[PDB]
Curated annotation (Swiss-Prot), chain B:
Disulfide bonds: none annotated. It is found in: Nucleus; Golgi apparatus; Cell projection, Cilium, Flagellum; Cytoplasm, Cytoskeleton, Spindle. Belongs to the cullin family. It is linked to Pseudohypoaldosteronism 2E: An autosomal dominant disorder characterized by severe hypertension, hyperkalemia, hyperchloremia, hyperchloremic metabolic acidosis, and correction of physiologic abnormalities by thiazide diuretics. This is Cullin-3. Forms neddylation-dependent homodimers. Component of multiple BCR (BTB-CUL3-RBX1) E3 ubiquitin-protein ligase complexes formed of CUL3, RBX1 and a variable BTB domain-containing protein acting as both, adapter to cullin and substrate recognition subunit. The BCR complex may be active as a heterodimeric complex, in which NEDD8, covalently attached to one CUL3 molecule, binds to the C-terminus of a second CUL3 molecule. Interacts with RBX1, RNF7, CYCE and TIP120A/CAND1. Part of the BCR(SPOP) containing SPOP, and of BCR containing homodimeric SPOPL or the heterodimer formed by SPOP and SPOPL. It comes from Homo sapiens. Neddylated. Attachment of NEDD8 is required for the E3 ubiquitin-protein ligase activity of the BCR complex. Deneddylated via its interaction with the COP9 signalosome (CSN) complex.
From Swiss-Prot, chain C:
InterPro entries: BACK (IPR011705), BTB-kelch_protein (IPR017096), BTB/POZ_dom (IPR000210), BTB_POZ_KBTBD2 (IPR030586), KBTBD2_BACK (IPR047074), Kelch-typ_b-propeller (IPR015915), Kelch_1 (IPR006652), SKP1/BTB/POZ_sf (IPR011333). Component of the BCR(KBTBD2) E3 ubiquitin ligase complex, at least composed of CUL3, KBTBD2 and RBX1. Interacts (via the BTB domain) with CUL3. Recognizes the BCR (BTB-CUL3-RBX1) E3 ubiquitin ligase complex substrate, PIK3R1, through the 4 tandem C-terminal Kelch domains. Residues 127-223 form the BACK domain. Pathway: Protein modification; protein ubiquitination. This is Kelch repeat and BTB domain-containing protein 2. Substrate-specific adapter of a BCR (BTB-CUL3-RBX1) E3 ubiquitin ligase complex that acts as a regulator of the insulin signaling pathway, modulating insulin sensitivity by limiting PIK3R1/p85alpha abundance in adipocytes. Targets PIK3R1, the regulatory subunit of phosphatidylinositol 3-kinase (PI3K), for 'Lys-48'-linked polyubiquitination and proteasome-mediated degradation. PROSITE patterns: BTB. GO terms for biological process: gene expression; glucose metabolic process; lipid metabolic process; phosphatidylinositol 3-kinase/protein kinase B signal transduction; proteasome-mediated ubiquitin-dependent protein catabolic process; protein K48-linked ubiquitination; regulation of cellular response to insulin stimulus; response to insulin. Residues 25-92 form the BTB domain. SMART domains: BACK (SM00875), BTB (SM00225), Kelch (SM00612).
Length: 563, 207, 561
């Protein structure tokens, strides 16, 4: 191999020459700023300077080149990267950095900024990044922007930059089958408002934008509104659209295929080859669709589903390369369509079984057996979904183990064996709450409306303690009627605007039975909503978690397994 | 064997089938017919037998029942149609027995419909769905059901027999019968009940 | 509800008794002068055709005497007694006529029973005969099974007398299929020719069709000259149509040419912990590792044998009881194309790791913990590949454990710790042979040429024995690293003696490498080192055998390098 010591010595000597200006022969003249540099470094880094000097043109012998349509700071950072290999990339100058990299055709900085932008893609810059990837060639960025823009924009459709988009880009966006919309009318009104941004600059594109939307809205309202905005005496558009909506037979999209499903993680691996797996139950389809494995079989993790219906994974441990397990603070995000876990910004401290709770757009991970264990062994930390970073919050006053947390009234409610503390994400403080009369642990709670339903606790039992936020008191309702001499595995969840329970029971010398019940809020009784047949759902285990979310049956595949 | 032998066997089988369809099955030699079918299908000539059966059945239908229904479209039209359907079923009983012994190989390997289904399909195509019989049957059934709705009593078991005949003619479910009967009947009931409601809202009160 | 305890048995027995006494009978069957008085109800419930015969409104329905022809008396009698008692008791000779009579009367249950019996008895010779019957008497299962058996065996025989008398469609289906187990393309050509030489001027159009079917690769060799010798006079357009079959019709390679000599392994280290062990294969030439499906998918400790016709068999083995390892005497055979295992006639004793040896077309299972508690603990049991039955033979002289057995010069040789006995198939007796000077067990032997190479034992003991000389001698020691336990495997490769050994040390990974051994050099030259990037660890109880397999039918074993 090439001697790295001599390579770094040569590089540092060249950078010293650059700083001291000894062997510089070519100077870059940009907006009156002198940039003394060499030809060898520029040729090695950029693919434009190699064609600027070794070309035989008038600049081959000229020692002063007036490089135009560039920026001084961008050129300076590119030169210093070429001279020392240090690329300081902030969150603002990456746009002009990519512009100058494409202008100068430098592959290394182009790849680096492409990776930075593939990491930086978020909701508030999705349309801007897609427009940037349409302007300057970037297939990878274009595809990532396609996916993220489709999802987040069809959720939001309010960005100001969406109005200033090319016709081809909008045709690609609207005609795609990856849009995430609960209805087919929101895309219609989004297209209408985009068209009405201008009057005559969009008339020619009117015949094309309607060609990608289904005819179910091409004969109903929002056709006379276009006639109102039609240019005067234009008889080539009204009669055109009058007899035009014959083709494009109505085909349902993919965004209207989201159903309230119970996502399960760390289930019992069907085949003994793997350790655990992830499955999902369909309360409506009455089937069990398989889910992608956790990233690097990440066990002992926590789940959260934001009001925007997004799944996240935090904490967990990976078997170190017989008992062998090491805890890692890696963070991941689940793609609802690609059926894969996209990595995100990792946490600061590793966790085991963390309680992920979403509130005000922030992901809160409370506790989880942190590595530190100092006097603040109860330190909790939130995540920024806008800036893609983690921020510490007010620590929990008391150290708790095997706890659960929910969000009610824009506040974080974490529950332990007998104590409860409410955290206000605004004042960043903890307030003492009501005290339970029973010592129970290893249970889960579901936030339904303005009440907290702590179900089960210790196997578990059928004890239920209902807490009211407005009343600030713990009261008993009833006990779930289950078979005696059994060990039910209770799982509290909210579904169909009602509090249902996923309770798996096992009898003596008998296999586990799956059944869910609907708890009557006013009657204080668990009614049999549906019985899960064992012909579709097999054993899941004991350390499995359940959460409420929506998934697409089309993108996912049915798990092939014998009843 | 030679083509002459199989041709003679098919000719005699066709003669026997025609004799059976002519209400003269009293002297039908079941043993002889079963043996000829055995020696016919055994030599791997089932396609010719199936084609000949279809041709004979459709020719007999067009010659006899198509003429009979059209000749008596006003004198006990539905009664004659029911009698023809019953005769067709009682002949296709034995026809289907023999050609179902055959069908155990044809319907399975050649992956085609059975001879009972073939007879039902050809009857549907040549009698019920005829260019003139279908509309006449629809009109007469609508007229008689409207007259029954008016208040006077007419025959009712006959309509049940006709509906059962159409349901059996569906041969898969309620695809043909449901459309053919309900849709004109649905429209007639719609207009009749609309007129009745319009008369009642003005001739009486909410009591 | 059908109460089977009281009424069903009593009703059936009383009906049988009434049949015996000729009571309450109203229909009698006339079969070439033989009278068979019976009842209409039993015939209706059993046969689908007899039901219609005594119901269809005709003269036969109201007819006390019916003259049913084209039916055998014995077959009709056995069908009637099966209808009256439920027991078929079918032999191996009258199956064809019984199936024909059952097909005419459309008796489904006996039809299914005979179909299963015929599909289980496509052994070696009736394959083409029952294939012709599978055509005549419509039977898809039988047709497919007989087609596969024909594609497997006729491609090695192609001289059966019954094969000559076949219909054109069946022959076209056989020849045009890409399942011909032929390593050469001229054998099918000469088979088609001899099928078109005994019947010429009668099937000339079918001759042209088969000529086109065999395609150019064999059409361009000799067929033109032979046809010129055998063409009818005054035939001109036949020359024009024959000349056309040179360019077109998609000349493509066959499948039988892919008989690569490989190694079949059993009880490997299963990546999927679900299976306790797996069966895989290795390619000496392609340098690839293929996998095979486990025959029982749950039973292990099996023995392997390869006939000269390249057939794989599995006998004996033990399976866990799965209560909430029991020994099973089941038998299996590996399909060279379907990648499955069709069971065969089970053994009479539940053996543990039996040693199967093939000789004179018979499979000989020597030892392997027969029942253990035998009065004569040293016994054997052989197999008939033609009659499909197990025949007891002369027992072992001495009781041995962890023994090995091979076949040399059409003679059975079994090797133990220090003794060896030769079993004479002609006389069914054991003759004493030479005694080894070294007492080593837990080893196997290979039958390469006319010399037996007993390798290993507890090591690297190389004791060579010759049948013509009847003596044991040492050659050399295999070069292996010390502080290790080698696992030796001796087997024939491409008509050359070679070994497959694995060395294991402390805190070290296993290495797989095969060496080429020379007879006069007494040295194991480095032939090929198996890279760990393609083959992973096997284990300790794995077995090795030589056989030819199909790469397309099998699947590659996925494993990370």
């Amino acid at each position: 191999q090439i001697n790295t010591e001599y390579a770094v010595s040569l590089l540092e000597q060249l950078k010293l020459f650059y700083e001291q200006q000894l062997f510089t022969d070519i100077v870059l003249i940009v907006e009156g700023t002198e940039f003394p540099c060499h030809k060898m470094v520029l040729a090695t880094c950029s693919s434009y300077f190699r064609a600027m000097f070794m070309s035989g043109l008038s600049e081959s012998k000229q020692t002063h080149v007036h490089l135009r349509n560039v920026d001084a700071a961008t050129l300076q950072i590119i030169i210093t990267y070429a001279y020392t290999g240090n690329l300081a990339m902030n969150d603002s100058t990456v746009e002009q950095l990519y512009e100058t990299a494409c202008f100068l055709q430098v592959e290394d900085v182009l790849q680096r900024c492409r990776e930075y932008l593939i990491k930086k893609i978020n909701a508030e810059n999705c349309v801007r990044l897609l427009s940037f990837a349409d302007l300057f060639s970037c297939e990878e960025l274009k595809q990532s922007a396609k996916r993220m823009v489709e999802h987040k924009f069809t959720a939001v459709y309010h960005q100001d930059a969406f109005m200033q988009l090319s016709h081809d880009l909008l045709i690609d966006i609207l005609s795609s089958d990856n849009l995430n919309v609960e209805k087919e009318e929101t895309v219609r009104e989004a297209a209408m408002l985009w068209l009405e941004y201008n009057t005559e600059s969009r008339s020619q594109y009117l015949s094309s934008v309607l060609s990608q939307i289904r005819i179910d809205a091409l004969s109903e309202v929002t056709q006379r509104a276009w006639f109102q905005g039609l240019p005067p005496n234009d008889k080539s558009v009204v009669v055109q659209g009058l007899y035009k909506s014959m083709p494009k037979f109505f085909k349902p999209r993919l965004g209207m295929t989201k159903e309230e499903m119970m996502i399960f993680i760390e289930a019992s691996s069907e085949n003994p080859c793997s350790l655990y797996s992830s499955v999902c139950y369909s309360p409506q389809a009455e089937k069990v669709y398989k889910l992608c494995s956790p990233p690097a079989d990440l066990h002992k993790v926590g789940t959260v589903v934001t009001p925007d219906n997004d799944i996240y994974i935090a904490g967990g441990q990976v078997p170190l390369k017989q008992t062998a397990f090491r805890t890692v603070n890696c963070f991941y995000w689940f793609d609802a369509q690609q059926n894969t876990w996209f990595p995100k910004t990792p946490m600061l401290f590793v966790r085991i079984k963390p309680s992920l709770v979403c509130c005000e757009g922030y992901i809160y991970a409370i506790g989880g057996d942190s590595v530190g264990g100092e006097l603040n062994r109860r330190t909790v930390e939130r995540y920024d979904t806008e800036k893609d970073e983690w921020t510490m919050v007010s620590p929990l006053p008391c150290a708790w183990q095997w706890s659960a947390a929910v969000v009610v009234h824009d506040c974080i409610y974490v529950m332990t064996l007998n104590l409860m503390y409410c955290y206000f994400p605004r004042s960043d403080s903890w307030v003492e709450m009501a005290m339970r009369q029973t010592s129970r642990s290893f249970a889960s709670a579901a936030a339904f409306g303005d009440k907290i339903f702590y179900i089960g606790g210790l196997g578990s039992s059928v004890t239920v303690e209902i807490y009211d936020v407005n009343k600030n008191e713990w009261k008993m309702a009833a006990n779930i009627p289950a078979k005696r001499y059994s060990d039910p595995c209770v799982r509290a969840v909210v579904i169909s605007n009602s509090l249902c329970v996923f309770m798996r029971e096992t009898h003596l010398n008998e296999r586990a039975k799956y059944v869910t019940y609907q708890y009557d809020l006013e009657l204080d009784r668990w009614s049999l909503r549906q019985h899960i047949s064992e012909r579709v759902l097999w054993d899941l285990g004991r350390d499995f978690r359940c959460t409420v979310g929506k998934l697409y049956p089309s993108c996912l595949e049915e798990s092939p397994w014998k009843p | 064997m030679d083509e002459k032998y199989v041709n003679s066997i098919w000719d005699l089988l066709k003669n026997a089938i025609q004799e059976i369809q002519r209400k003269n099955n009293s002297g039908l030699s079941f043993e002889e017919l079963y043996r000829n079918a055995y020696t016919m299908v055994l030599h791997k000539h089932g396609e010719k037998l199936y084609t000949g059966l279809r041709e004979v059945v459709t020719e007999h239908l067009i010659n006899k029942v198509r003429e009979d229904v059209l000749n008596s479209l006003n004198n006990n039209f539905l009664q004659t149609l029911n009698q023809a359907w019953n005769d067709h079923q009682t002949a296709m009983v034995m026809i289907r027995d023999i050609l179902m012994y055959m069908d155990r190989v044809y319907v399975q390997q050649n992956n085609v419909e059975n001879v009972y289904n073939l007879g039902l399909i050809i009857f549907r195509d040549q009698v019920v769905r005829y260019g003139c019989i279908r509309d006449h049957l629809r009109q007469t059934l609508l007229d008689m059901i409207a007259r029954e709705r008016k208040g006077e009593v007419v025959d009712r078991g006959a309509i049940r027999n006709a509906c059962q005949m159409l349901m059996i003619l569906g041969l898969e479910g309620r695809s043909v019968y449901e459309e053919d009967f309900e849709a004109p009947f649905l429209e007639m009931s719609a207009e009749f009940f609309q007129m009745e409601s319009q008369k009642f809202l003005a001739e009486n009160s909410a009591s």
